[PDB]
């Protein structure tokens, strides 16, 4: 009884005429997605530390299966319809070995923004943390880490590719959250991404809005097929 096993088939008809997945439509349909989906919201002045210099504003844990969904009334895109395709696709697999592409949009600022990547940092958070409320010794820009400095006067969307730097055979996706091992902190996430502002100058009254979109890469692979966890229909989100 392999996962695909037909003991005695009673097929009354011939098969349906073969299409290619791109004929009566013009694209090849297979399970690969570089479609970009959201990851976070907005920040205000009252969130940042008293000394906001070389201090990151966001601590983003890197998970192929996305972040732990949290419904708000300010953000209906999480509440009325669940998280995007990517985390539901990764829910049917166990391991990954590729890097992720990050597209980041910062709208309330016209001043320079930085983005740094910390591969070896243990991914023990399932939600992004902002400013003052960020753990100390975190959201401090490091020196010798992969980074990208961009001016918002030129372009206010940052596109970078986060590499796969894990000292292991695989990368674990769909990791539990609260209480450990040595496989949940160094082998699950690609690490953390720190987003900060070059200047220590105060945040505009209206505040700043950071929308992080991400996609899969080419050297990325969903290695082992697991059973699908029971899903929730978005169509029944009103009763």
């Amino acid at each position: 009884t392999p996962n695909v096993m037909q003991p005695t088939p009673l097929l009354p008809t011939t098969n349906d005429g073969r299409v290619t997945f791109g004929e009566a439509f013009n694209d090849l349909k297979d399970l690969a997605r570089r479609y970009q989906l959201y990851w976070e919201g907005t920040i205000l002045e009252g969130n940042l530390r008293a000394i906001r210099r070389n201090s990151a504003l966001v601590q983003l844990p890197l998970y192929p299966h996305g972040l732990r969904i949290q419904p708000d009334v300010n953000n209906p895109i999480w509440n009325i319809m669940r998280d995007g395709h990517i985390p539901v696709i990764s829910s049917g697999f166990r391991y990954f070995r590729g890097g992720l592409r990050l597209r980041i949009v910062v709208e309330g600022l016209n001043s320079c923004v930085w983005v740094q990547h910390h591969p070896d940092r243990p991914s023990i958070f399932s939600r992004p943390i902002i400013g003052r409320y960020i753990a100390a010794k975190d959201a401090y820009r490091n020196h010798a880490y992969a980074a990208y400095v961009q001016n918002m006067s030129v372009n206010r969307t940052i596109e970078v590719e986060v590499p796969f730097y894990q000292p292991g055979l695989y990368g674990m996706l769909n990791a539990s959250d609260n209480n450990t091992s040595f496989d949940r902190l160094r082998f699950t996430g690609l690490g953390d991404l720190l987003i900060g502002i070059e200047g220590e100058q105060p945040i505009p009254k209206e505040g700043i809005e950071i929308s992080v979109y991400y996609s899969i890469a080419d050297d990325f692979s969903f290695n082992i097929f697991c059973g699908f966890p029971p899903m929730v229909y978005c169509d029944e989100t009103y009763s």
Binding site: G22, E23, A24, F25, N26, D27, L28, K29, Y35
Partner: protein, 54 residues
Amino acid sequence: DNPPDPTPAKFFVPIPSHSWAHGTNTSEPTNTLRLDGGVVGVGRSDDIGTSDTA
């Protein structure tokens, strides 16, 4: 080896959009809202004739 590229910048003129007048005998660059990011056109058969716009 991170060789320098001191190759002269090229004077370029920025514009918002591509021609609004051109309708034939040229290419019109655009952001196709598809999954396939190449030259893509609807599939056809004899059930679906050519454009009858002579």
